[PDB]
Amino acid sequence: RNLSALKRHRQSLKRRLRNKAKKSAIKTLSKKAVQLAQEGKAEEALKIMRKAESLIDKAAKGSTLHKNAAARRKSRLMRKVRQLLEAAGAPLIGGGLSA
Amino acid sequence: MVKIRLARFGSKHNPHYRIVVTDARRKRDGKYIEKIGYYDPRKTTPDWLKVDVERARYWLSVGAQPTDTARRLLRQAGVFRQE
Amino acid sequence: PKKVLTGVVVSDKMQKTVTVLVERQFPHPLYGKVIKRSKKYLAHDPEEKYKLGDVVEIIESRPISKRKRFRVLRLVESGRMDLVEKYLIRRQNYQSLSKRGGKA
RNA sequence: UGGAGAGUUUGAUCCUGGCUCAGGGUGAACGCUGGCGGCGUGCCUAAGACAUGCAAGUCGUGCGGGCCGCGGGGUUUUACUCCGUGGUCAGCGGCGGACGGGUGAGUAACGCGUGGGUGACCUACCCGGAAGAGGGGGACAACCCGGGGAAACUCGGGCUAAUCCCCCAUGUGGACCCGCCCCUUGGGGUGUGUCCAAAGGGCUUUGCCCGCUUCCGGAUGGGCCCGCGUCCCAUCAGCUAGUUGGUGGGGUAAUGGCCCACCAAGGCGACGACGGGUAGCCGGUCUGAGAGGAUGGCCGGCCACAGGGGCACUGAGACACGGGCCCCACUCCUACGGGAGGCAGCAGUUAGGAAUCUUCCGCAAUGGGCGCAAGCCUGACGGAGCGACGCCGCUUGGAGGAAGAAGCCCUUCGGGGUGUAAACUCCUGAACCCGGGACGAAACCCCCGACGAGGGGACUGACGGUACCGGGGUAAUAGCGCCGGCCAACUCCGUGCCAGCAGCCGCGGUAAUACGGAGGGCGCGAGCGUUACCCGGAUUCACUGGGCGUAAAGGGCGUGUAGGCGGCCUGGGGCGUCCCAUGUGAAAG
Numbered sequence: 009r010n011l012s013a014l015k016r017h018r019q020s021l022k023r024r025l026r027n028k029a030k031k032s033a034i035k036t037l038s039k040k041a042v043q044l045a046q047e048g049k050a051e052e053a054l055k056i057m058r059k060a061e062s063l064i065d066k067a068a069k070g071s072t073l074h075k076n077a078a079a080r081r082k083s084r085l086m087r088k089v090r091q092l093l094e095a096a097g098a099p100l101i102g103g104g105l106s107a
Numbered sequence: 108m109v110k111i112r113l114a115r116f117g118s119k120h121n122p123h124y125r126i127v128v129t130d131a132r133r134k135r136d137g138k139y140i141e142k143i144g145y146y147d148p149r150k151t152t153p154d155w156l157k158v159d160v161e162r163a164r165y166w167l168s169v170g171a172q173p174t175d176t177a178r179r180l181l182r183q184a185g186v187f188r189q190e
Numbered sequence: 191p192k193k194v195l196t197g198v199v200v201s202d203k204m205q206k207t208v209t210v211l212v213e214r215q216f217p218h219p220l221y222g223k224v225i226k227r228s229k230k231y232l233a234h235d236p237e238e239k240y241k242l243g244d245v246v247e248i249i250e251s252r253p254i255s256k257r258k259r260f261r262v263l264r265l266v267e268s269g270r271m272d273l274v275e276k277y278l279i280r281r282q283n284y285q286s287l288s289k290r291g292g293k294a
Numbered sequence: 295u296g297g298a299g300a301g302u303u304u305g306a307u308c309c310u311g312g313c314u315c316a317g318g319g320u321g322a323a324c325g326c327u328g329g330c331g332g333c334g335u336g337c338c339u340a341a342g343a344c345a346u347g348c349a350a351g352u353c354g355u356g357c358g359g360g361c362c363g364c365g366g367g368g369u370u371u372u373a374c375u376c377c378g379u380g381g382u383c384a385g386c387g388g389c390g391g392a393c394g395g396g397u398g399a400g401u402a403a404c405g406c407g408u409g410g411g412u413g414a415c416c417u418a419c420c421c422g423g424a425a426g427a428g429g430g431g432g433a434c435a436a437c438c439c440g441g442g443g444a445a446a447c448u449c450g451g452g453c454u455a456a457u458c459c460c461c462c463a464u465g466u467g468g469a470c471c472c473g474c475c476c477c478u479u480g481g482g483g484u485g486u487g488u489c490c491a492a493a494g495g496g497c498u499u500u501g502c503c504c505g506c507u508u509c510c511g512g513a514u515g516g517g518c519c520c521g522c523g524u525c526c527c528a529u530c531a532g533c534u535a536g537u538u539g540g541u542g543g544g545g546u547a548a549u550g551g552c553c554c555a556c557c558a559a560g561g562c563g564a565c566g567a568c569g570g571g572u573a574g575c576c577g578g579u580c581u582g583a584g585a586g587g588a589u590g591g592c593c594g595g596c597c598a599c600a601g602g603g604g605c606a607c608u609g610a611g612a613c614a615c616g617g618g619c620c621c622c623a624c625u626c627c628u629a630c631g632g633g634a635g636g637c638a639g640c641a642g643u644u645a646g647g648a649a650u651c652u653u654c655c656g657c658a659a660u661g662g663g664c665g666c667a668a669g670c671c672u673g674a675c676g677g678a679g680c681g682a683c684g685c686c687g688c689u690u691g692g693a694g695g696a697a698g699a700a701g702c703c704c705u706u707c708g709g710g711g712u713g714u715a716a717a718c719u720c721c722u723g724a725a726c727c728c729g730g731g732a733c734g735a736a737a738c739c740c741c742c743g744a745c746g747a748g749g750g751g752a753c754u755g756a757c758g759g760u761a762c763c764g765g766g767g768u769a770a771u772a773g774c775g776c777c778g779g780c781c782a783a784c785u786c787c788g789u790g791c792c793a794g795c796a797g798c799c800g801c802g803g804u805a806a807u808a809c810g811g812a813g814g815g816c817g818c819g820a821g822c823g824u825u826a827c828c829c830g831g832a833u834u835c836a837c838u839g840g841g842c843g844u845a846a847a848g849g850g851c852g853u854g855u856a857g858g859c860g861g862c863c864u865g866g867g868g869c870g871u872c873c874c875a876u877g878u879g880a881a882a883g
């Protein structure tokens with residue numbers, strides 16, 4: 009009985025949530041950003057796409073994402089957005105993309 | 108983290124250490140990266156500490172970290188002495 | 191060095207992929223006689239370029255599928271269908287050797 | 295530098311051929327016997343089940359408190375209330391818990407071995423280099439209040455600090471899209487755009503110590519991929535539907551049918567696929583003249599497993615032995631709803647077995663974790679303990695002593711043997727007693743110097759009153775196997791194809807060097823025998839190194855597929871083959 013390093017388990021759960029949520033926000037912001045481009049609404053589109061770019065880079069500050077996991081999440085998202093605007097668009101706000 | 112430390116090599120009651128570089132998570136007498144000296148504590152022979160400063164210096168230069176004992180032996184064989 | 195084998199295309203019935211056959215002469219361990227011995231590699235033909243009969247060099251590469259770990263490095267000589275036919279009879283024989291039915 | 299053979303098929307012979315013996319080896323067990331030490335080594339079976347204890351924590355120099363003290367303040371006094379300090383308890387937070395220790399159940403597999411790849415990658419702590427930390431907000435335990443449950447534990451309500459979480463800034467720099475250059479797989483630049491930083495603590499208190507942030511490099515440790523090597527059965531010949539490839543996705547640190555949708559119809563196999571059987575692999579180990587054969591036990595490397603089957607969370611790292619969830623089987627508590635366990639860590643118990651150890655001592659050394667340090671924690675480990683289980687060393691005495699005591703033995707009735715053996719004379723002195731008494735240990739820390747180099751000082755021994763040295767000193771354990779041949783060593787008595795022996799051939803039927811006893815003898819000796827197993831002899835699976843007319847063995851004969859093999863001359867290539875250089879071949883052995 010008893011081994012006071014079940015403190016570790018205790019705090020793993022606390023973290024399980026910090027991460028869980030951070031990730032959730034990225035996924036739903038991303039989908040959203042990509043949905044704004046499949047409707048070709050570039051002003052809003054990049055404006056969100058940018059908020060999600062941030063959300064990713066931030067998650068990778070601590071242990072939620074790190075490395076090139078983030079960098080992946082980023083391009084795979086940034087790519088799909090430019091391309092869905094290529095289907096008739098003209099990057100209005102052109103926030104998070106290169107000329 | 109890589110160490111510079113004494114691996115145990117004598118026999119019962121007759122200890123001989125082998126000063127080595129190794130990853131700190133190896134078992135004490137296990138696989139090492141490189142031997143760079145030896146040391147008999149009981150001074151049974153006129154030669155009982157040897158080092159090779161250059162290799163010792165080399166490893167230190169890349170963050171080998173010596174146990175408080177290996178450092179004593181290292182120091183004593185003039186590993187540190189800069190004057 | 192990325193290992194490089196030379197072989198014979200015995201199959202291109204596959205999108206973007208050849209089956210290069212590579213042989214190796216060597217003295218036998220115990221008995222000393224020289225024995226040939228050969229192995230089929232799947233090679234990446236990205237631009238459906240090489241065709242069966244080609245003799246190609248095959249190069250060790252980061253994996254393209256399972257089975258697929260080589261890319262066709264260059265063309266040596268072409269057309270030589272002898273080895274293709276050679277390899278082809280070899281398997282046609284299998285029709286017998288069984289319990290069932292088929293003229294080998 | 296290395297190579298021995300013998301016995302047995304016949305009246306006899308040569309040959310063929312099997313069986314057997316002589317050697318070596320052992321994590322052994324068994325019988326008889328048993329004296330001291332050193333060093334090793336010790337569940338081969340039940341990866342059966344496990345009582346009790348101990349086995350991974352640490353940091354007050356990250357933070358705020360609860361309980362118990364002691365002391366000092368604000369008021370004339372009380373009340374309330376402020377500060378300091380000793381002890382203690384957990385909480386929040388950081389690093390460790392992914393190492394170290396255990397096992398070989400599974401696994402015939404890129405698992406292992408060896409050589410390569412990664413332009414397809416990760417790497418906490420450590421080293422080096424470049425640059426930085428400005429402003430602001432939040433929550434949850436602790437604590438306080440209340441509720442449910444037998445219990446494990448559990449729900450709700452209210453405060454709160456931080457090196458906990460968050461938003462803004464600065465952008466050295468990095469990340470992402472698009473373009474351009476170099477490079478050639480996703481490598482290295484470069485431009486616009488967008489995105490991303492930080493934490494404080496300590497003092498000998500304006501400067502140091504320890505931390506934090508971003509980037510580049512190093513070191514060390516890993517992931518993945520590839521060539522070749524890796525047991526038996528063909529009385530297992532066909533196998534495959536994510537199957538084989540494509541495109542696009544998802545996923546990951548990263549490649550990949552790893553997974554998914556859609557498309558093509560492929561992929562593998564007699565060079566043994568598929569199935570079955572067996573097995574952790576290696577360095578090595580035993581044997582062998584060698585080639586080979588056998589093996590993988592101590593130790594070291596890798597892999598796999600942590601009651602059985604799945605799964606993810608947290609993390610630099612886990613699909614996590616002493617972490618989480620679920621299903622199964624089993625033991626335990628139970629107020630019948632429900633809970634608790636997991637020695638293949640150290641000891642230990644029980645079961646199974648021919649058989650395998652102490653519920654020991656110590657953190658003194660070495661190594662590890664956290665800590666600035668002092669320290670703490672280490673059943674890692676260093677030691678002791680049991681067992682002739684193995685190796686090595688050592689004793690049971692040494693010199694004299696009859697022409698040869700006694701007893702037992704034999705005899706040709708003279709004798710001959712045990713035998714210098716004993717007795718006995720002298721000489722050393724294992725055991726045992728007394729005295730001294732270790733090496734292993736010098737660092738961390740402290741002082742001078744500068745917290746560097748360097749110098750000075752102090753503390754520390756489980757083993758252990760041991761090893762070793764000095765003095766005193768007693769004649770003071772010998773067994774076991776064998777004696778027909780192989781194979782060193784023969785004589786009496788008893789027995790009568792019985793009782794028995796026996797590795798093989800074989801002994802015993804009334805004169806037994808073969809059975810049981812005795813005397814004697816041979817061989818080893820704190821051991822000697824036995825049984826079991828591996829190599830050897832066994833050229834008895836033959837590559838080295840065999841055979842097939844009659845000893846075992848030519849397919850009933852052809853035709854021919856694959857495959858093996860292939861005349862003479864010249865030229866190219868350089869796959870095989872040979873040569874030079876160089877890298878690798880860890881340590882142990």
Ligand SMILES: [Mg+2]
Binds near residue numbers: 036
């Ligand atoms: Mg949603």
Ligand SMILES: [Mg+2]
Binds near residue numbers: 303
């Ligand atoms: Mg005969």
Ligand SMILES: [Mg+2]
């Ligand atoms: Mg005869």
Ligand SMILES: [Mg+2]
């Ligand atoms: Mg014979």
Ligand SMILES: [Mg+2]
């Ligand atoms: Mg006994």
Ligand SMILES: [Mg+2]
């Ligand atoms: Mg012992």
Ligand SMILES: [Mg+2]
């Ligand atoms: Mg076992």
Ligand SMILES: [Mg+2]
């Ligand atoms: Mg228990």
Ligand SMILES: [Mg+2]
Binds near residue numbers: 348
């Ligand atoms: Mg303890």
Ligand SMILES: [Mg+2]
């Ligand atoms: Mg505490």
Ligand SMILES: [Mg+2]
């Ligand atoms: Mg282990």
Ligand SMILES: [Mg+2]
Binds near residue numbers: 402
């Ligand atoms: Mg199998």
Ligand SMILES: [Mg+2]
Binds near residue numbers: 404
């Ligand atoms: Mg693998």
Ligand SMILES: [Mg+2]
Binds near residue numbers: 412
């Ligand atoms: Mg690489």
Ligand SMILES: [Mg+2]
């Ligand atoms: Mg640095």
Ligand SMILES: [Mg+2]
């Ligand atoms: Mg504040």
